[PDB]
Amino acid sequence: LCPLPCVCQNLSESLSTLCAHRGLLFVPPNVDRRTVELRLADNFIQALGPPDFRNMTGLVDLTLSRNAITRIGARSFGDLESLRSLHLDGNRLVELGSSSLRGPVNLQHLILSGNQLGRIAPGAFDDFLDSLEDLDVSYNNLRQVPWAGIGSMPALHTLNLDHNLIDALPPGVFAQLSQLSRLDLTSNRLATLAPDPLFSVLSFSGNPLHCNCELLWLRRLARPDDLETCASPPTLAGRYFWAVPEGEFSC
Amino acid sequence: LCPLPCVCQNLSESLSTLCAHRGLLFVPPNVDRRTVELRLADNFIQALGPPDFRNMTGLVDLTLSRNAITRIGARSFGDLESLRSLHLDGNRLVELGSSSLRGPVNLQHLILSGNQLGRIAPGAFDDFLLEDLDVSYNNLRQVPWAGIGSMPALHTLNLDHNLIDALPPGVFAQLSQLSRLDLTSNRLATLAPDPLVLSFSGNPLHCNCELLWLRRLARPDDLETCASPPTLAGRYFWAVPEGEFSCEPPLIA
Ligand SMILES: *[C@@H]1O[C@H](CO)[C@@H](O)[C@H](O)[C@H]1NC(C)=O
């Protein structure tokens, strides 16, 4: 029912197995399959596979933050049909495959920040497309985000793409995102941007902005100074984006 | 001389140029060369080169924490002779070269944690052979032991949260002042008893006769776990009785 290092709190017909900061080397196999909240954060589990979370139908909240997971097997979360939140932050993941995130069909929160993700498959989020309300891919090495998947989530209200290496933002990626309230693009490799609407919150500070005529539409907006800086042309290098007059954006 | 976004505090002939959280894309070139404390943390500077810190003789404290440094040029800190502390944590450094950490001759503290360091040159630290060396939270499989073993003043070595699988027999031999050694969350399966505070939790310990010496020590339970043999897998290292650490001769040359 409860693994030796773990503590189980039985709420009104609801199981919560807490194994946080207990020095685990791998997910314990003696966890009850009736558990709803599985907390495995601050451990040292390096590998996830199919038998770790097999037959767990009613698992709602699974947190695996600040671990040492370098590899996630094909269909590790395959039986997690009720999974509404999945935390995989502060890990060593480099590539996310199509089979890795298969399973949580009603997933609403996906935290994948603080890893070393360089490539994510285009069909990785295909099983949790409609449901996904929050997508966090902060602090990774991402050059290209899977825009086809991220653009097919009608319920997404938060997308954290900050602290990555994204050099291009296409024009069809912002289309069809009605509930999008937050889009963080801080600390990336973006030099140019294309006129995008729905300006209610977009952050783009710490980007190598090319302050010329192509970036004059953005300079005309009523937005706060988030300390955005010009990296090129050399005359504008070092100067704040919101402090340089509109007449100095020449070609 | 003070750069437009930076604030300079002159406290009794002590220049403190603070540029933290200013959204800088690169180290400003209008910084006074007489500065002693240069704070450039929480900035978005991605590249360091030799003209960024040239002619700064009296620079003692240089902090570049939580930035986006992916590359450090050859002899970037070349003229920082007085540099006693260098913070380069929370960055994107993957490989440290021999010429990269050249310059600070009297360096006493070196923080290189939170990066993605996979390889470090053997002669990178050859200029300051240091009191504190931090290489935590990186992807290090092998650290420069020949360099780390040639620092007679080293009192702290943080190797935790890396991928170190082996610890050589004669490295800490020349380390007399070593008081702290963090080895938490690594790939270490076996340890050798070579003394003269050590943490080793979160390692894939092979709990047999080879680690029985460690089990006999009067140490607190830092939640160390056995990964092998299969009978001891999952159980705590400090909870398994000493009689259960059995083995067969290793038969090696
Ligand atoms: C200001 O700093 C300079 C050295 O850069 C020093 O000569 C001067 O005395 C300092 N001013 C005060 C009031 O301490």
PDB file of C-alpha atoms in Angstrom, chain A residues 4-5 21-26 43-44 66-68 92 115-116 139-141 162-165 186-187 205-207 226-231 237-238 240, chain B residues 5 21-26 44 66-68 70 92 115-116 137-140 161-163 184-185 201-205 223-227 233-234 236:
ATOM      1  CA  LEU A   4       8.857   2.108   3.117  1.00  0.00           C
ATOM      2  CA  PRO A   5      10.380   5.650   2.543  1.00  0.00           C
ATOM      3  CA  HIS A  21      13.538  14.478  -0.945  1.00  0.00           C
ATOM      4  CA  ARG A  22      13.896  10.853   0.179  1.00  0.00           C
ATOM      5  CA  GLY A  23      17.067   9.889  -1.794  1.00  0.00           C
ATOM      6  CA  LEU A  24      15.314   7.533  -4.222  1.00  0.00           C
ATOM      7  CA  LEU A  25      17.400   6.098  -7.063  1.00  0.00           C
ATOM      8  CA  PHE A  26      14.270   4.961  -9.046  1.00  0.00           C
ATOM      9  CA  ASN A  43      15.039  12.590  -5.482  1.00  0.00           C
ATOM     10  CA  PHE A  44      17.784  11.061  -7.715  1.00  0.00           C
ATOM     11  CA  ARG A  66      14.586  18.531  -9.585  1.00  0.00           C
ATOM     12  CA  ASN A  67      15.539  14.880 -10.253  1.00  0.00           C
ATOM     13  CA  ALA A  68      18.314  13.450 -12.531  1.00  0.00           C
ATOM     14  CA  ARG A  92      18.696  16.255 -17.700  1.00  0.00           C
ATOM     15  CA  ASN A 115      16.346  20.829 -18.691  1.00  0.00           C
ATOM     16  CA  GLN A 116      18.730  20.746 -21.732  1.00  0.00           C
ATOM     17  CA  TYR A 139      15.527  27.422 -19.442  1.00  0.00           C
ATOM     18  CA  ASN A 140      16.345  24.840 -22.160  1.00  0.00           C
ATOM     19  CA  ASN A 141      18.559  24.868 -25.337  1.00  0.00           C
ATOM     20  CA  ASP A 162      11.909  32.140 -22.325  1.00  0.00           C
ATOM     21  CA  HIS A 163      15.623  31.435 -21.714  1.00  0.00           C
ATOM     22  CA  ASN A 164      16.128  29.360 -24.846  1.00  0.00           C
ATOM     23  CA  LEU A 165      17.937  29.817 -28.245  1.00  0.00           C
ATOM     24  CA  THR A 186      12.762  36.681 -22.748  1.00  0.00           C
ATOM     25  CA  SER A 187      16.451  35.720 -23.368  1.00  0.00           C
ATOM     26  CA  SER A 205      13.704  41.515 -23.308  1.00  0.00           C
ATOM     27  CA  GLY A 206      17.218  40.113 -23.675  1.00  0.00           C
ATOM     28  CA  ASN A 207      16.953  39.476 -27.409  1.00  0.00           C
ATOM     29  CA  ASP A 226      11.027  45.762 -20.039  1.00  0.00           C
ATOM     30  CA  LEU A 227      14.728  46.838 -20.499  1.00  0.00           C
ATOM     31  CA  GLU A 228      14.906  45.664 -24.150  1.00  0.00           C
ATOM     32  CA  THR A 229      18.265  46.541 -25.780  1.00  0.00           C
ATOM     33  CA  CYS A 230      19.502  47.054 -29.399  1.00  0.00           C
ATOM     34  CA  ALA A 231      22.403  44.783 -30.427  1.00  0.00           C
ATOM     35  CA  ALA A 237      24.229  48.921 -29.904  1.00  0.00           C
ATOM     36  CA  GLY A 238      23.962  49.182 -26.116  1.00  0.00           C
ATOM     37  CA  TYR A 240      17.599  50.824 -24.879  1.00  0.00           C
TER      38      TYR A 240
ATOM     39  CA  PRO B   5      22.626  51.922 -17.050  1.00  0.00           C
ATOM     40  CA  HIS B  21      19.247  43.343 -13.571  1.00  0.00           C
ATOM     41  CA  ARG B  22      19.840  46.054 -16.275  1.00  0.00           C
ATOM     42  CA  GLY B  23      18.991  43.975 -19.372  1.00  0.00           C
ATOM     43  CA  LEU B  24      22.541  44.223 -20.756  1.00  0.00           C
ATOM     44  CA  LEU B  25      23.265  42.333 -23.977  1.00  0.00           C
ATOM     45  CA  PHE B  26      27.101  42.616 -23.509  1.00  0.00           C
ATOM     46  CA  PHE B  44      21.682  38.757 -20.839  1.00  0.00           C
ATOM     47  CA  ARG B  66      22.535  34.012 -14.032  1.00  0.00           C
ATOM     48  CA  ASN B  67      23.506  35.383 -17.475  1.00  0.00           C
ATOM     49  CA  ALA B  68      23.467  33.638 -20.922  1.00  0.00           C
ATOM     50  CA  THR B  70      27.731  30.357 -24.037  1.00  0.00           C
ATOM     51  CA  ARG B  92      25.352  28.084 -20.902  1.00  0.00           C
ATOM     52  CA  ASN B 115      26.088  25.447 -16.505  1.00  0.00           C
ATOM     53  CA  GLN B 116      26.266  22.456 -18.973  1.00  0.00           C
ATOM     54  CA  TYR B 137      24.978  21.193 -11.500  1.00  0.00           C
ATOM     55  CA  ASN B 138      26.870  20.500 -14.752  1.00  0.00           C
ATOM     56  CA  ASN B 139      27.235  17.389 -17.068  1.00  0.00           C
ATOM     57  CA  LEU B 140      30.812  16.527 -15.919  1.00  0.00           C
ATOM     58  CA  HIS B 161      24.901  17.121  -9.340  1.00  0.00           C
ATOM     59  CA  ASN B 162      27.153  15.889 -12.150  1.00  0.00           C
ATOM     60  CA  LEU B 163      27.775  12.531 -13.966  1.00  0.00           C
ATOM     61  CA  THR B 184      25.785  14.307  -4.043  1.00  0.00           C
ATOM     62  CA  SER B 185      23.871  13.118  -7.182  1.00  0.00           C
ATOM     63  CA  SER B 201      23.737  10.796  -1.207  1.00  0.00           C
ATOM     64  CA  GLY B 202      22.028  10.041  -4.517  1.00  0.00           C
ATOM     65  CA  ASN B 203      24.720   7.769  -5.922  1.00  0.00           C
ATOM     66  CA  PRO B 204      24.249   4.222  -7.328  1.00  0.00           C
ATOM     67  CA  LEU B 205      26.134   2.560  -4.439  1.00  0.00           C
ATOM     68  CA  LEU B 223      19.485   9.378   2.883  1.00  0.00           C
ATOM     69  CA  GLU B 224      22.047   7.269   0.937  1.00  0.00           C
ATOM     70  CA  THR B 225      20.478   4.349  -0.960  1.00  0.00           C
ATOM     71  CA  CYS B 226      21.754   0.985  -2.341  1.00  0.00           C
ATOM     72  CA  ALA B 227      21.190   0.409  -6.079  1.00  0.00           C
ATOM     73  CA  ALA B 233      18.205  -2.288  -3.975  1.00  0.00           C
ATOM     74  CA  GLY B 234      15.872   0.402  -2.622  1.00  0.00           C
ATOM     75  CA  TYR B 236      18.884   2.753   2.875  1.00  0.00           C
TER      76      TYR B 236
END
